[PDB]
Scaffold this motif. Structure first.
Motif, short mmCIF file in Angstrom:
data_model
loop_
_atom_site.label_atom_id
_atom_site.label_comp_id
_atom_site.label_asym_id
_atom_site.label_seq_id
_atom_site.Cartn_x
_atom_site.Cartn_y
_atom_site.Cartn_z
N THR A 1 -11.47 1.78 -4.91
CA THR A 1 -11.00 2.56 -3.73
C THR A 1 -11.32 4.04 -3.96
OG1 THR A 1 -9.26 0.92 -3.55
CG2 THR A 1 -9.04 2.82 -2.12
N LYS A 2 -12.03 4.65 -3.00
CA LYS A 2 -12.44 6.08 -3.08
C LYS A 2 -11.19 6.97 -3.09
CE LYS A 2 -16.13 8.13 -0.60
NZ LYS A 2 -16.68 8.25 0.77
N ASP A 3 -10.63 7.21 -4.28
CA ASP A 3 -9.42 8.05 -4.45
C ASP A 3 -9.50 8.80 -5.77
OD1 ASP A 3 -6.77 8.21 -2.73
OD2 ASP A 3 -6.11 8.33 -4.83
N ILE A 4 -8.67 9.84 -5.91
CA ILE A 4 -8.61 10.70 -7.13
C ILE A 4 -8.04 9.89 -8.30
CG2 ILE A 4 -7.39 12.70 -8.08
CD1 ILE A 4 -9.55 13.80 -6.61
N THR A 5 -7.26 8.83 -8.03
CA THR A 5 -6.73 7.93 -9.10
C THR A 5 -7.88 7.49 -10.02
OG1 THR A 5 -4.70 7.16 -8.05
CG2 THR A 5 -5.80 5.58 -9.49
N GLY A 6 -9.03 7.10 -9.45
CA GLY A 6 -10.21 6.61 -10.18
C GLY A 6 -11.16 7.74 -10.57
N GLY A 7 -11.17 8.83 -9.79
CA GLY A 7 -12.05 9.98 -10.02
C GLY A 7 -11.61 10.82 -11.21
N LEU A 8 -10.30 11.08 -11.35
CA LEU A 8 -9.80 12.07 -12.36
C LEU A 8 -10.11 11.58 -13.77
CD1 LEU A 8 -6.39 13.58 -11.13
CD2 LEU A 8 -8.44 14.82 -11.82
N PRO A 9 -9.92 10.29 -14.10
CA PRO A 9 -10.31 9.81 -15.42
C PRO A 9 -11.80 10.05 -15.70
CG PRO A 9 -8.85 8.26 -14.36
CD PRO A 9 -9.27 9.25 -13.29
N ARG A 10 -12.63 10.12 -14.67
CA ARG A 10 -14.07 10.35 -14.93
C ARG A 10 -14.24 11.82 -15.27
NH1 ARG A 10 -18.50 8.18 -11.08
NH2 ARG A 10 -18.62 5.96 -11.62
N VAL A 11 -13.45 12.63 -14.58
CA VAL A 11 -13.50 14.09 -14.77
C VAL A 11 -13.02 14.37 -16.19
CG1 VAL A 11 -12.34 16.23 -14.21
CG2 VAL A 11 -13.28 14.85 -12.34
N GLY B 1 0.85 -1.20 0.00
CA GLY B 1 0.00 0.00 0.00
C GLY B 1 0.87 1.23 0.00
N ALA B 2 1.94 1.19 0.80
CA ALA B 2 2.81 2.36 1.00
C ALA B 2 3.44 2.77 -0.34
CB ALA B 2 3.88 2.01 2.01
N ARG B 3 4.15 1.82 -0.93
CA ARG B 3 4.87 2.03 -2.18
C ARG B 3 3.89 2.34 -3.30
NH1 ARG B 3 9.29 -1.96 -4.27
NH2 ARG B 3 9.93 -1.17 -2.21
N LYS B 4 2.71 1.72 -3.31
CA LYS B 4 1.78 2.09 -4.41
C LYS B 4 1.40 3.56 -4.23
CE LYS B 4 -0.62 1.10 -8.13
NZ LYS B 4 -1.69 2.10 -8.37
N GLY B 5 1.25 4.00 -2.99
CA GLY B 5 0.97 5.42 -2.70
C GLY B 5 2.05 6.32 -3.25
N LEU B 6 3.29 6.03 -2.91
CA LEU B 6 4.45 6.85 -3.33
C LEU B 6 4.61 6.86 -4.85
CD1 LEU B 6 5.78 8.34 -1.29
CD2 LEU B 6 7.45 6.51 -0.94
N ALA B 7 4.37 5.73 -5.51
CA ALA B 7 4.52 5.59 -6.97
C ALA B 7 3.40 6.39 -7.61
CB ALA B 7 4.45 4.15 -7.39
N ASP B 8 2.25 6.38 -6.94
CA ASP B 8 1.08 7.15 -7.40
C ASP B 8 1.48 8.62 -7.44
OD1 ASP B 8 -0.38 4.92 -7.90
OD2 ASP B 8 -2.13 5.48 -6.66
N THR B 9 2.22 9.12 -6.45
CA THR B 9 2.46 10.59 -6.45
C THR B 9 3.36 10.92 -7.64
OG1 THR B 9 4.40 11.61 -5.55
CG2 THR B 9 3.18 10.18 -4.03
N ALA B 10 4.40 10.11 -7.87
CA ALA B 10 5.34 10.32 -9.00
C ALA B 10 4.62 10.21 -10.35
CB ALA B 10 6.48 9.33 -8.89
N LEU B 11 3.68 9.27 -10.50
CA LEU B 11 3.31 8.90 -11.89
C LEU B 11 2.02 9.61 -12.26
CD1 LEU B 11 4.30 5.14 -12.01
CD2 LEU B 11 5.68 7.22 -12.16
#
Ligand code: MG
Ligand code: ZN
Lengths: 277, 49, 49, 79, 1350
Positions: E1105-1115, E764-774
């Motif tokens: 998962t309720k996050d902007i990762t999934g929300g922004l593509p909808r936007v 979870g941690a590393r997926k979080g950190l990779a999410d911020t970079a990518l």
DNA sequence: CACGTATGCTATAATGTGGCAGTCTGACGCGG
DNA sequence: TCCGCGTCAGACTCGTAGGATTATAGCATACGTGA
């Protein structure tokens, strides 16, 4: 789906006639007398020869096609100056011409800056010498070591190895990936910074004000000499062209203008302050 | 502050003269852009007033 | 990736049909790669290199 | 003012026009050497123009009227 | 030079010759020995100019005296070296060469012009095949390809009287011969006779091309190059590095390729070479030119020295790195610096610590200037040396210059405008920049090593724009929402909280003081705690009806600390503001209140005071952390051992037979999820309170002063969530797949996680950190697409005087009102005199800014719906009106004309995304008593007695007495309602229960169940059990299904006892329910159903998962208008409908309107089930199908406000899920930019005809003059463009090119001969001019009126 | 004349080419 | 119309360090500009 310029051309060459010995003789006699078809057929039939040497001449300067075309230029000269009267075969004679023209083109077009074959030939011997030295001296050749072996001047060897240095691409970046290009590091030098340009505007401006501060006859021969106000930078003896027309009186008055101006810089606050500069 | 060559020196002189006036010009990057598009064989002209 | 064989599969991706197309990839240490793959119509295909 | 420029915006209105008018006035004092209506008090030309606008002495219309007046005086002198 | 516009057009061979100052014949660069330019080489001085200023090459003429004196001997003009950057040359090509950009760039112009496929042209160009140019004998017509052998045949038979050729000469001849006029008429004649739907587009597009070609005055021959231009030397420089080596541009290598092969071609033509060899050289020549123009487009790019492809001309323009994005839409800048930032708590809000040595350097010219006016420096070089020596007098002068001079601070990334702010600098000893805490929010500045850029505004104008517009103090409110960002936290809020918070008795409980001063004196004397509950006499100052302040004296029951804070509080404010325990949330409201009552200078002083007192009392306290601070629930192991034996019992039941992997996974996750909540709640009930404080006699309970609890409750730092994994249970961790591990982490951070708990955390941690970079980069790409689309939008007018208004209702979703109507219409112009209930006296007027006072009146009257003026409905052409927009949320008053609104909108939508980079919903329980209101609902009564809903869209509302809507509740399909329509329920009643996992298929009719098309292995699957044998059916979808069953729809069909079909009450429809993917039916065929029963359970896996990762593509999908795979159907026109044809099951719904006699017939899928039944009078855009709606279809049928509101709500759903407040008006701006273009039917007095796409503003302009004068009226239809296309559809090609796709943009503009008049902002920024907005709007409008005369 | 730079000529027969890209990925068109 | 290669996209400043390789025969006759 044959789209490639190379594979198309090589297809066209394969589609030619291959010549024999007696056929080469018949065509060659007609060719030198000035036959159209004989020239065309001898060239087109011997294209394969160009390619076989052109394929073994790649990865040096130009591309396969580039070498193939210049090699073809050699084939043309070969057909023009071929001697069918000599019993000896064409393929042998043509090989010389094709190698000659390819080598010559590779020596010119490759080097970004046009280099003479004279220096290039000298360079070749320096490099071959380096090879033999490297095999026996486990290290690599020094310029001095090469110079001792050829019995030639160290300076001349260094000049030559100085022309061997290849040119680097400025458009190509350095910072790991694409962070900055060599262009963006390297500044325009012939162009002065605005601080330097503004400093000259202040000196030139000061001179105009300095000209209306000394004597009227002390800034008429001091500036018309240096070319400050005048059109041409004259010398002590050449100030005589205007109205001065003297050699002694011009030299006394030039330095008299500078001595009063030296006190003007000592009082304003420069002199030794602006001596470092 | 960037390309405008004449502009930057002129405004430097104004700031030492205490004028604090800009006197803008044409960015040299744009002059290059034009030359690079004409090198492609596209006529790109400035149309006057 | 260690040389050897690998059996992989686009889990959907291609064809909103949503068909899992299975593939084999033979990876040498040196040489051309040898691919086998399925098509939506269950035809076995080879891609050399 | 010194700290904040809200009061001077309330005099003219458009922040954009406030800046043009304060600029024009600061240029007069910078170049022309026009005398400031408020005591300088070691203030830069930028702040003095904003003081004058705050108190309602300087304004686009007022500046235009006095430009015409000085310009007509110079026309009078030339003729 | 100062110009109006820029035009682009195809270069004529002769045009190219005009720019040239000579033909470069030779590849020679410079001489190896005298490093000077070679004869007629690439750096020839005779062509491009002198290497040194006013000096010829051979050196005969020197000095500025010689001006334009072309030296006879060497042939070099005596001018400045600058000329070599501007003078061009040229190259005489032996063979004509096609220009890759017009050939390869799709669609292509050469192909579209000849109506000839690319393949054919290429065969011709690489000399594979001949093409016929013209044969009088129709034997061979035009553009017909002949192979080598095909050319031999006709050549003997016809020959001569038919012309066919090969290579670019052929195509140039074909282009020269083609008559643009005649083909235009022939193509018009074809469209008249037989206009086929799809080929009408392509024919109309070639017609537009032909017309545009003739209007541009471009000639098709010029697509083929005879003359090739050469770039000036200094723009492809050969310079010496220090090492003695040279370094050069790759353009030099590409030019040398072209010249070598071209000259070799001249040679082989002089030598009459055989044609095979001529052909090879012509191929190689075209290859070299195409590499020089655009390398990599024509296939394999030419690799230079490393292996990297040579950078060609187009590559220097195109890429992000080209020249647009890198050197022109942003630049490196003078009088710029940077350093690490650090706190300056001592600073006032408008100040920043600027290091001495940094400021010395930045203000160098300003120092030089004052030095010379004081006569301390004789000249500039002496002033420079005085600075170099850093003399003591220089510091005093530098101090004098910096006074009242604002400096810009910038932090990357600059997401929104507050990422740049102006400050008045304070000279400080030391190398770090000091930043004011309260603005750290806007910059997203935290001092763990962040750095900032400093920039010096030089001009008086720039200084004023910094002090007035960009100053910290003046940018208090955010441009996005009205809520401010400037607010202290951390230590500042901690100290205020400690003081405000009152403890039991303490020192001097229940004393009485004369005012806050006796209180301060008591505390500092050490006779009173700050938390002593004692009554004090304070005099508050409340504002009256006018500007006068009323004074009021009363005894208040607060604490010593709050009394002392009252001293900081300015007069005007109520004492009730300080009387609560203050946190950061309360202090932000305090400063906003103070700003709106008192004004700017008072809030500025008050903000400083709050910071000073906050720090001061923050150090006087001294709370911290420890090891006992983190309290652990005593009854934690009791809830762990219970939950653990429970999960154990289900694992033992797994081997028995009641459990699949999915069922037990769900059951174990549910057990641990409830255990986690339990332990967290008990942990929070032993930490928040659990304070045994013996009050003055006996025991009491009060709030705990445990350190971490105070930190969390104050909102200073950690939240309850962070304390859940600190002293509580860590909880269930989720794998990288998103599926959750069955064994949770019962141990916490205080107790220490085991090797396995830590390892599992890592995922979870590393997926979080990779999410911020990518993921940051898609967010940022969305910001940039938004910005490009809404750059032009500027406030142009004050009042368009339109009555149009977007009806905005209160967002009441999920019981508790999500967003109030008051806050949704706060600071927006009202449309239509909207009074109170009693229609007899006007309450509110028309265009009137809704201030907080008007809004408070609205709430007493409880107005639900208000038509307000919106950006979308504004009539203003080429911008928007101050009234349609409303308040500048950043200023707190009506927007100023000239403000660049679009940019602010794009930034404010973009920022949150870039910065931001419990499923127990089973029963609705109603919070307040009322009557059930069910709008949009069709349910069937089941044998239980209960109302089982079978509608898709179901909205349960809670009406009170008076009859207002107050709570909402989305009832699903398959729901059991407790009570039916309009029935009374009490507080805390359950009104509907449904299963969240499984959406059941619920049958309306009663009877027997029939298996249609449900062949095992083909469409379904069979799975059998032991002893007796329960089989269960799973519906395999087309994904797992065989080719055989593809065409079969599997469906449970309702037949009766006889085995006839049961009808659905009152229709001709027989009951049949189409089972989708993996519909798990238990009960096997022939089972008597009652109505309202669950047939089939489709599994509803909610792994999202309720996050902007999934929300922004909808936007992004909404802004770009991405049509869905199953668009919702809607009624086109109003009128009365019956059914006609059917394809097996596929409905052909036939609308036959009442007045409009023409029908409208639609093909419809069989399985898609209709909401409407048969003959109803439905209006335009009545919802027929279930499924998501395309914004296109909404606009096209319902209209503007409908589609605008759809986008606003669907976007805002995402951002609201993440707690992000953006005002609707920003989204509305961008939707306006989406609805820029419109297609036209018929002609007017201009050149419209069928289906041209023109901007809406320009066709309205035409329609205004047409309606006054008459002429042919033109029907129009607005088109929606999603962001990327909308930005490319802008009629500025400088903005289109700078955005994306630069190669394609410039070919289409060059062929159209398009003229850019530089209207937009990007256009003006590129040419380095004044923006047509903000400061520049004054100047720009003066230029537009200078166009009328002089 | 001379130094640097260039073009020249030689003869056993020989006569169809060949170093990588490592499958990014969702998106949106343009020929069959 | 649809399967499919083709073509176009993928936050903002700061840093670090410099940089590579290969080989083209021996010789004479020749053309070009400065003294
Ligand atoms: Mg932090
Ligand atoms: Zn000369």
């Amino acid at each position: 789906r044959v789209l490639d310029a190379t594979q198309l051309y090589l297809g066209e060459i394969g589609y030619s006639p291959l010549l024999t010995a007696e056929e080469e003789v018949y065509f060659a006699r007609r060719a030198l007398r000035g036959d159209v078809a004989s020239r065309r057929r001898m060239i087109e039939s011997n294209l394969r020869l160009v390619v076989k040497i052109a394929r073994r001449y790649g990865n040096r300067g130009l591309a396969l096609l580039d070498l193939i075309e210049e090699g073809n230029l050699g084939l043309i000269r070969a057909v023009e100056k071929f001697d069918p009267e000599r019993g000896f075969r064409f393929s042998t004679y043509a090989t010389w011409w094709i190698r000659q023209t390819i080598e010559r083109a590779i020596m010119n077009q490759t080097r970004t800056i046009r280099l003479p074959i004279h220096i290039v030939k000298e360079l070749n011997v320096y490099l071959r010498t380096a090879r033999e030295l490297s095999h026996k001296l486990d290290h690599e050749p020094s310029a001095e070591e090469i110079a001792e072996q050829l019995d030639k001047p160290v300076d001349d060897v260094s000049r030559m190895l100085r022309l061997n240095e290849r040119i680097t691409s400025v458009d190509t970046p350095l910072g790991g990936d694409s962070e900055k290009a060599l262009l963006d590091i390297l500044a325009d030098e012939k162009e002065n910074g605005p601080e330097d340009t503004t400093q000259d505007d202040d000196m030139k401006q000061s001179i105009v004000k300095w000209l209306f501060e000394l004597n009227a006859k002390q800034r008429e021969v001091l500036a018309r000499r240096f070319g400050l106000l005048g059109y041409e930078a004259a010398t002590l003896e050449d100030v005589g062209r205007e109205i001065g027309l003297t050699r002694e009186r011009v030299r006394q008055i030039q330095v008299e203008g500078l001595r009063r101006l030296r006190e003007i810089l000592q009082t304003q606050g420069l002199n030794i302050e602006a001596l470092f500069l | 502050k960037s390309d405008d060559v004449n502009g930057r020196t002129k405004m430097y002189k104004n700031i030492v003269d205490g004028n604090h006036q800009m006197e803008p010009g044409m960015p040299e990057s744009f002059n290059v852009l034009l030359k690079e598009i004409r090198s492609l064989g596209i006529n790109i002209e400035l149309e006057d007033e | 990736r260690s040389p050897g064989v690998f059996f992989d599969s686009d889990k959907g991706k291609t064809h909103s049909s949503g068909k899992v197309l299975y593939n084999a990839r033979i990876i040498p240490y040196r040489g051309s790669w040898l691919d086998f793959e399925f098509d939506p119509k269950d035809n076995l295909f080879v891609r050399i290199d | 003012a010194r700290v904040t420029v809200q009061d001077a915006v309330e005099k003219i209105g458009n922040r954009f026009d406030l800046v043009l008018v304060a600029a024009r006035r600061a240029r007069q004092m910078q170049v022309g050497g026009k005398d400031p209506l408020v005591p300088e008090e070691n203030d830069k030309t930028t702040v003095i123009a904003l003081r004058e606008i705050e108190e309602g002495l300087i304004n686009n219309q007022i500046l235009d009227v006095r430009e015409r007046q000085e310009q007509q005086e110079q026309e009078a002198a030339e003729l | 030079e100062e110009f109006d516009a820029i035009k682009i057009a195809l270069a004529s061979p002769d045009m190219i010759r005009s720019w040239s100052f000579g033909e470069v014949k030779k590849p020679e660069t410079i001489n190896y020995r005298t490093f000077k330019p070679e004869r007629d080489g690439l750096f020839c001085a005779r062509i491009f100019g002198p290497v040194k200023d006013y000096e010829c090459l051979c050196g005969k003429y020197k000095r500025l005296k010689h001006r334009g004196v072309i030296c006879e001997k060497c042939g070099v003009e005596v001018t400045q070296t600058k000329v070599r950057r501007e003078r061009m040359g040229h190259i005489e090509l032996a063979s004509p060469t096609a220009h890759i950009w017009f050939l390869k760039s799709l669609p292509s112009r050469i192909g579209l012009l000849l109506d000839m496929p690319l393949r054919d042209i290429e065969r011709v160009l690489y000399f594979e095949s001949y093409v016929v140019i013209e044969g009088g004998m129709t034997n061979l017509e035009r553009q017909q390809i002949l192979t080598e052998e095909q050319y031999l045949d006709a050549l003997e038979e016809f020959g001569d009287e038919f012309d066919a050729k090969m290579g670019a000469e052929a195509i140039q001849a074909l282009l020269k011969s083609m008559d643009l006029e005649q083909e235009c008429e022939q193509l018009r004649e074809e469209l008249n006779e037989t206009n086929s739907e799809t080929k009408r587009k392509k024919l109309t597009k070639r017609i537009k091309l032909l017309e545009a070609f003739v209007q541009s005055g471009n000639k098709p021959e010029w697509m083929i190059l005879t003359v090739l231009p050469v770039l000036p030397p200094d723009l492809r420089p050969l310079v010496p590095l220090d090492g003695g080596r040279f370094a050069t541009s790759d353009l030099n290598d590409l030019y040398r390729r072209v010249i070598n092969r071209n000259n070799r071609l001249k040679r082989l033509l002089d030598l009459a070479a055989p044609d095979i060899i001529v052909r090879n050289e012509k191929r190689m020549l075209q290859e070299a030119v195409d590499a020089l123009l655009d390398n990599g487009r024509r296939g394999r790019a030419i690799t230079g020295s490393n292996k990297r492809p040579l950078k060609s001309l187009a590559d220097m323009i195109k890429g992000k790195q080209g020249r647009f994005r890198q050197n022109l839409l942003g630049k490196r800048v003078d009088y710029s610096g940077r350093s690490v930032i650090t706190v300056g708590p001592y600073l006032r809000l408008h100040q920043c610590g600027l290091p001495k040595k940094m400021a010395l350097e930045l203000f160098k010219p300003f120092i030089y200037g004052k030095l010379e006016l004081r006569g301390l420096a004789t000249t500039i070089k002496a002033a420079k040396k005085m600075v170099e020596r850093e003399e003591a007098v220089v510091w005093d002068i530098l101090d004098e210059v910096i006074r009242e001079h604002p400096v810009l601070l910038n932090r990357a990334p600059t997401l929104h405008r507050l990422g740049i702010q102006a400050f008045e600098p304070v000279l400080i000893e030391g190398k770090a920049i000091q930043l004011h805490p309260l603005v750290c929010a806007a910059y997203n500045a935290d001092f763990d090593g962040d750095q900032m850029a400093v920039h010096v505004p030089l001009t008086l104008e720039a200084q004023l724009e910094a002090r007035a517009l960009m100053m910290s103090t003046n940018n208090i409110l955010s441009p996005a929402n009205g809520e401010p960002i400037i607010v202290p936290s951390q230590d500042v809020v901690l100290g205020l909280y400690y003081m405000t918070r009152d403890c039991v008795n303490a020192k001097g409980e229940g004393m009485v003081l004369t005012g806050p001063k006796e209180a301060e004196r008591l505390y500092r004397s050490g006779l009173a705690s700050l938390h002593a509950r004692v009554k004090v006499r304070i005099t508050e100052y409340e504002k009256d009806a006018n500007g006068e302040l009323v004074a009021k004296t009363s005894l208040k029951d607060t604490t010593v600390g709050r009394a002392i804070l009252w001293m900081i509080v300015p007069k005007g404010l109520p004492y009730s503001i300080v009387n609560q325990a203050l946190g950061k949330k309360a202090i932000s409201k305090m400063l906003n209140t103070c700003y709106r009552i008192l004004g700017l200078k008072p809030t500025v002083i008050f903000a400083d005071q709050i910071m000073y007192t906050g720090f001061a009392y923050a150090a006087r306290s001294g709370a911290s952390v420890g090891i006992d601070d983190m309290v652990i629930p005593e009854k934690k192991h009791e809830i762990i051992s219970e939950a653990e034996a429970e999960v154990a019992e289900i694992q033992e039941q797994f081997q028995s037979g009641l459990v699949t992997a999915g069922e037990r996974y769900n059951k174990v996750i549910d057990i641990w999820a409830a255990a986690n909540d339990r332990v967290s709640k008990a942990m929070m009930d032993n930490l928040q309170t659990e304070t045994v404080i013996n009050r003055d006699g006996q025991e009491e309970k009060q709030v705990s002063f445990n350190s971490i609890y105070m930190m969390a409750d104050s909102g200073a730092r950690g939240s309850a969530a962070q304390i859940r994994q600190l002293a509580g249970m860590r909880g269930l961790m989720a794998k990288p797949d998103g599926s959750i591990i069955e064994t949770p982490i019962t141990a916490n951070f205080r107790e220490g996680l085991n090797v396995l708990q830590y390892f599992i955390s890592t995922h979870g941690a590393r997926k979080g950190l990779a999410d911020t970079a990518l993921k940051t980069a898609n967010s940022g790409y969305l910001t940039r697409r938004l910005v490009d689309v809404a750059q032009d939008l500027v406030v142009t007018e004050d009042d368009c005087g339109t009555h149009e208004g977007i009806m905005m209702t209160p967002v009441i979703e999920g019981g508790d009102v999500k967003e109030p109507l008051r806050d949704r219409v706060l600071g927006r112009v009202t449309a239509e005199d909207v009074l109170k209930p009693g229609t007899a006296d006007i309450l509110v007027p028309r265009n009137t800014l809704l201030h907080e006072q008007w809004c408070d009146l609205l709430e007493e009257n409880s107005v639900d719906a208000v038509k307000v003026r919106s950006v979308v409905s504004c009539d203003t052409d080429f911008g928007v009106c101050a009234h349609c927009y409303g308040r500048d949320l950043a200023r707190g008053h009506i927007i100023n004309k000239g403000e660049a609104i679009g940019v602010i909108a794009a930034q404010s939508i973009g920022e949150p995304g870039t910065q931001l980079t419990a499923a127990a919903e089973s029963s609705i329980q109603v919070k307040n008593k009322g009557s059930i209101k069910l709008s949009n609902v069709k349910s069937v009564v089941n044998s239980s007695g209960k109302l089982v809903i079978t509608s898709r869209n179901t909205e349960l509302k809670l009406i009170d007495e008076f009859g207002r809507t107050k709570e909402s509740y989305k009832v699903p399909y398959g729901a059991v309602l407790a009570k039916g329509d309009g029935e009374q329920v009490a507080g805390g009643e359950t009104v509907a229960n449904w299963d969240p996992h499984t959406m059941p298929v619920i049958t309306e009719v009663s009877g027997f169940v029939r298996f249609t098309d449900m062949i095992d292995g083909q469409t379904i699957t069979r799975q059998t059990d032991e002893l007796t044998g329960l089989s269960s059916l799973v519906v395999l979808d087309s994904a797992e299904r065989t080719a055989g069953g593809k065409d079969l729809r599997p469906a449970l069909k309702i037949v009766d006892a006889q085995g006839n079909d049961v009808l659905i009450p009152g229709t001709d429809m027989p009951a049949q329910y189409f089972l989708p993917g993996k519909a798990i039916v238990q009960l096997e065929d022939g089972v008597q159903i009652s109505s309202g029963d669950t047939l089939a359970r489709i599994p509803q896996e909610s792994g999202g998962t309720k996050d902007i990762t999934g929300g922004l593509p909808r936007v992004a999908d909404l802004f770009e208008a991405r049509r869905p795979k199953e668009p919702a159907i809607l009624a086109e026109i109003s009128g009365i409908v019956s059914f006609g044809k059917e394809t097996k099951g596929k409905r052909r719904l036939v609308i036959t309107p009442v007045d409009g006699s023409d029908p409208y017939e639609e093909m419809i899928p069989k399985w898609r089930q209709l909401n409407v039944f048969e003959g109803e009078r439905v209006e335009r855009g009545d919802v027929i199908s279930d499924g998501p709606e395309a914004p296109h279809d909404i606009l096209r049928l319902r209209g503007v406000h409908a589609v605008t509101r759809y986008i606003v709500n669907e976007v805002q759903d995402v951002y609201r899920l993440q707690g992000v407040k953006i005002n609707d008006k920003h989204i509305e701006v961008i939707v306006r930019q989406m609805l820029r273009k419109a297609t036209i039917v018929n002609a007017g007095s201009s050149d419209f005809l069928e289906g041209e796409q023109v901007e809406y503003s320009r066709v309205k302009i035409a329609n205004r003059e047409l309606e006054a004068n008459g002429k042919v009226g033109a029907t129009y239809s607005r088109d929606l463009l999603g962001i990327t296309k909308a930005s490319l559809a802008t009629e500025s090609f400088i903005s289109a090119a700078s955005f994306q796709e630069t190669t394609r943009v410039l070919t289409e503009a060059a062929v159209a001969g398009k003229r850019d008049e530089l209207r937009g902002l990007k256009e003006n920024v590129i040419v380095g001019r004044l923006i047509p907005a903000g400061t520049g709007y004054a100047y720009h409008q003066d230029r537009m009126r200078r166009r009328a005369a002089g």
